Design a protein around this ligand. Structure first.
Ligand SMILES: O=C(O)[C@H](O)[C@@H](O)[C@H](O)[C@H](O)COP(=O)(O)O
Length: 248
């Protein structure tokens, strides 16, 4: 009955829904990442604001693939921007996504994951449209419910899900808040980062296992906070440096 238990039970139920409903899509996404690695392509992940947190969770990560890179749009990487409200305004700016993609090392055949719960703003929609125009394969992590219950804020009238090769449904109901209290007018307690981080790890774990099953040793990193982790990782980062853009 207490709020903590209600929230955690809501988050568990959402993870169960992802496990039971998105198993085949997670497999397809992990397979696309493994194909891209095998074929010599690069891997990138993007999200704006709090959707950036799931993208970051798979980059330079203990237990994660060394080959996953972050596509950084300045001002929308997490909520670090001053003022934080500028992050929200930048999600509406047409042309930011193309500036960032065109400057990046992404090329035809690469894979880009785009995390956007709503999928409705100009920046993630444009990011997907322009990435596909550049020949990238695009995986979206998005709550498809928003596409029927909200209006697109992109000029095209379309949502992120309309421009993805693979769509992973992150299930969160409109409002991104799992609890209500009779005395309290706004809902509270968002689970979207819990779910998207979990979805992202399921995808990259699938990619790692798929590489392994093909006789390809997955380039996995170890935690730098267990003795010996940084030495292990140094080997891996050097080995795959050509497709890694967060170090040299
Ligand atoms: O207001 C909210 O819903 C979040 O606090 C906000 O930071 C969100 O994470 C970004 O606006 C990106 O939203 P999308 O994930 O829908 O792209």
């Amino acid at each position: 009955h207490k709020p903590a238990g209600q929230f955690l039970d809501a988050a568990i139920d959402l993870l169960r829904r992802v496990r039971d409903e998105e198993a085949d899509s997670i497999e397809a996404a992990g397979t696309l990442l493994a194909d891209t690695v095998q074929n010599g392509g690069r891997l990138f992940a993007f999200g704006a604001g709090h959707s950036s947190l799931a993208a970051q969770d798979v980059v330079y990560r203990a237990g994660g693939l060394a080959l996953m890179n972050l596509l950084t749009v300045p001002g929308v990487v997490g909520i670090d921007v001053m003022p934080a409200t500028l992050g929200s305004a930048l999600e509406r700016v047409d042309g930011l996504a193309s500036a960032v993609l065109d400057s990046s090392p992404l090329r035809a055949g690469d894979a880009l994951v785009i995390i956007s719960l709503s999928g409705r703003n100009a920046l993630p929609v444009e990011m997907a449209m322009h990435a596909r125009a550049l020949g990238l394969r695009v995986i979206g992590v998005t709550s498809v419910a928003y596409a029927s219950q909200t209006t697109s804020r992109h000029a095209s009238g379309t949502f992120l899900k309309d421009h993805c090769d693979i769509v992973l449904d992150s299930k969160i109901a409109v409002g991104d808040a799992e609890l209500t209290l009779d005395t309290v007018p706004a809902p509270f307690a968002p689970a979207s980062t819990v779910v998207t981080a979990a979805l992202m790890q399921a995808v990259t774990a699938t990619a790692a296992a798929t590489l392994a099953d093909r006789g390809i040793e997955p380039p996995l990193l170890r935690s730098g906070n267990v003795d010996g982790g940084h030495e292990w990782n140094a080997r891996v980062l050097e080995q795959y440096g050509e497709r890694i853009f967060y170090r040299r």
